[PDB]
Amino acid sequence: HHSGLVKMSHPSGDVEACMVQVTCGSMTLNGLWLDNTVWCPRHVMCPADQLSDPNYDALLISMTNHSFSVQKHILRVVGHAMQGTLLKLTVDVANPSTPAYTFTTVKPGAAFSVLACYNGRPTGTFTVVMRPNYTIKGSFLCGSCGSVGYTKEGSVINFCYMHQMELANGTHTGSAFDGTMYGAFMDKQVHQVQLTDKYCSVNVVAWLYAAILNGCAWFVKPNRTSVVSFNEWALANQFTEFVGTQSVDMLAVKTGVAIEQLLYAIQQLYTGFQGKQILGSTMLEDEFTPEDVNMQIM
Amino acid sequence: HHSGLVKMSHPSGDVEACMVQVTCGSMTLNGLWLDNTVWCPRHVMCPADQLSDPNYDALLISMTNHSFSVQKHILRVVGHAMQGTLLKLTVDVANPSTPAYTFTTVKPGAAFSVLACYNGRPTGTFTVVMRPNYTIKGSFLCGSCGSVGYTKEGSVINFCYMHQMELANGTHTGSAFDGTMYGAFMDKQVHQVQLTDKYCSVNVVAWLYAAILNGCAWFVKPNRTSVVSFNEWALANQFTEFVGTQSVDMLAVKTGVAIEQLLYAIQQLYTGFQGKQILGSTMLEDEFTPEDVNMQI
Ligand SMILES: *[C@H](O)[C@H](C[C@@H]1CCNC1=O)NC(=O)[C@H](CC(C)C)NC(=O)O[C@H]1CC[C@H](CC)CC1
Ligand SMILES: *[C@H](O)[C@H](C[C@@H]1CCNC1=O)NC(=O)[C@H](CC(C)C)NC(=O)O[C@H]1CC[C@H](CC)CC1
Fold first, then answer.
1. Which residue ranges does the record assign to the Peptidase C30 domain (chain A) (predicted)?
2. How far is CA B232 from CA A7, A31, A124, B94, in A?
3. Distance, CA A165 to ligand 1 centroid (Å)?
4. How many CA atoms, within 13 angstroms, populate the side-chain half-sphere of residue B187?
């Protein structure tokens, strides 16, 4: 039986109306136009020559307001400033389609939508999970920097990601809108190695609840492992710490299966399912969130 | 190495702008507002009581324009007609933000984006493949009927799907905008014969090409199988006819691996990968298209 549990993105219209193209000399990428501000990655300021030890403090100083061209396809720059790894450009027109929005950094295991853009033109949307090593997967090619990731709660869009780079292993990372880069990473063109990844325990729990909700519960036993004992075990077996939420608790209540029974199950299934399947899979899945499961199965 | 091959949907803004809620007596669902026309599933006319064998012709006759209420959240009806399994409602105001559009009927193996809506409010977007048995997977709950699926050629939206129903196995089907149901399913709440799914061979080929481009070519041998023998093989082993395309050919040029090498490979890998992996999987994947792979890699 098909669960109906699929990778689902937020509708992108609200964010499509905010996307612009930013150009600084030879470099062109994408920007986010909210009210009188345009956000974009600061390496738009760097010529490909100096991309390996860029001196951003001196590059900023050398710019005037005319150094920046902002175009809308899907504007006059009257101020410029640097905030971490992002530029904050002030323009003389307030975006007439600015959504209600917040800037909140996301934590590992959280899911968000990405609107992939090239030259200020939205081309596609997909959902990603911030991994415990502060990378995301997804699809990003040359020119995609400035593409934004976001969630939506009510009328309020939370902008949480602005795309910056791709790593050697093909994963990706970027900034939060406070200007910090997710994970270590520096916006320089140099080899950077990401930390070891980990399974997102709370998302595995959610997925196993989805399985129970879908009729697949051969893996449930009376046996239980406590949260504290699971987290001790998790440090040493490449799982994140489990933190519960009202969202998980809703699934426990709905199914009548306690969280602690699923943490025990995870300790057994970790290694393989010995010929059985769960939701058409033979390994644990950690990219669906409790919120995903509550939305799409109930 | 993460290949960068993901399930990508079209930006939904253009379509969000056309979504409305349609109410008829006690039922409500979603509709599509293009110019002066609102499209919605005709079972909006059916009371819950009588969803097993509705008399749609008599329901339509029983109606008047004032039976139907249309509201845009994300409107007065002055005409109403039935086209197959859909209603075509004429409203007095034209949708100003009507995108350039056409109506197309997707074929099995083809991908399209879905805007899932409840009460006229877009809530989510995902991509599906029309399966060889004319169903789709996706995520659709109560109130989702009237959600639409679409492709894009340029700035032009091709509307191909309006959601109608769920089958006992959890899969879904809907109407094309000419009013016909994909796969001849009836918009009646009754058990119906669902054919068996098959592997979309052309998408399997595209996936193997993606593996090659990602530096996973362990399965590539100089051995070759012709299209016609493969297609003969495919009938007895739950695969679809392979039909080449310019998109596929681009991939054999990019990689330098010929189609027939991969058709031979499919015949071997169908039995299992024998301890090895392809793009993190131990089974063949058939929901990424030639167009996906070219676009994303
Ligand atoms: C801005 O559009 C790009 C996005 C890259 C391009 C290729 N795929 C992407 O996601 N960002 C960068 O190019 C970035 C600039 C520095 C200054 C941060 N550098 C970068 O991502 O380089 C990568 C390119 C890919 C290779 C392959 C492993 C490694 C370095
Ligand atoms: C219109 O919004 C719904 C969408 C369904 C409902 C639940 N999930 C969906 O995809 N369509 C219907 O409700 C449909 C109406 C008839 C007149 C076509 N009925 C329907 O899909 O019946 C299904 C419901 C689930 C059961 C499962 C054994 C089979 C029949």
1. 3-298
2. 35, 52, 37, 52
3. 4
4. 26
Task: Give the DSSP per-residue string, A210-237.
Answer: HHHHTT--TT--S----HHHHHHHHHTT
Strand A172-175 relative to strand B19-24: parallel, antiparallel, unpaired? unpaired
Q: Are the C-beta atoms of B73 and B21 separated by less than 8 Å?
A: yes
Q: Are B1 and A170 in contact (CB under 8 A)?
A: yes
Are A32 and A39 in contact by the 8 Å Cβ rule? The answer is yes
The four Cα atoms A160, B97, B60, B116 give a dihedral, to 10 degrees, of -10
Nearest CA to B128 among B160, B104, B164, B86? B160
CATH, residue A287: 1.10.1840.10
Buried-state track B9-18, b at ≥16 Cβ within 10 A, e below 16: bbbbbbbbbb
Distance of CA A76 to the CA centre of its chain: 31
Amino acid at B224: R
- The span from the CA of B133 to the CA of B192, in Å, is 12
Whats the size of chain A, residue-wise?
298
Q: Are A132 and A108 in contact (CB under 8 A)?
A: yes
Distances (CA, A) of A107 to A62, A75, A112, A132, A244: 35, 34, 11, 8, 14
Q: Is the dihedral of CA A44, A48, A49, A50 positive or negative?
A: positive
- The answer to whether B9 contacts A9, with C-beta atoms less than 8 Å apart, is yes
Task: Give the tokens for residue A283.
Answer: 């390994």
In angstroms, the CA A174 to CA A165 distance is 6
Task: Give the span between the Cα atoms of A161 and A64, in whole angstroms.
Answer: 27
Residue B284: C-alpha distances to residues A145, B119, B201, B240 (Å): 32, 38, 10, 14
Check if A188 contacts B (Cβ < 8 Å): no
From CA A45, how far away is CA A137, in angstroms rounded? 26
SS3 for A258?
coil
**Interface list for B 94-123 with A (CB within 8 A):** 115-116, 122-123
The identity of residue A18, as a single letter, is: C
Name the residue among A17, A124, A169 with its Cβ closest to that of B8: A124
Q: What is the CA radius of gyration of chain B?
A: 22
State which residues form the domain around A261: 201-297
Residue B242 burial by Cβ neighbours in a 10 Å radius (0-12, 13-18, 19+):
buried
Nearest-CA neighbor of B4 among B213, B220, B290, B203? B213
> CB–CB of A232/A205 below 8 Å?
no
Residue with tokens 């399209």: B112
Residues B197 and B185: beta-carbon distance below 8 Å: no
Interface test with B, best of A3, A5, A9 (most B CBs within 10 A): A9
Catalytic residue flag (residue A4): no
By what method was this entry solved? Answer: X-ray
> What stretches of chain A adopt beta strand conformation (E)?
19-24, 27-34, 37-41, 69-71, 77-83, 86-91, 101-103, 111-118, 121-129, 148-153, 156-166, 172-175
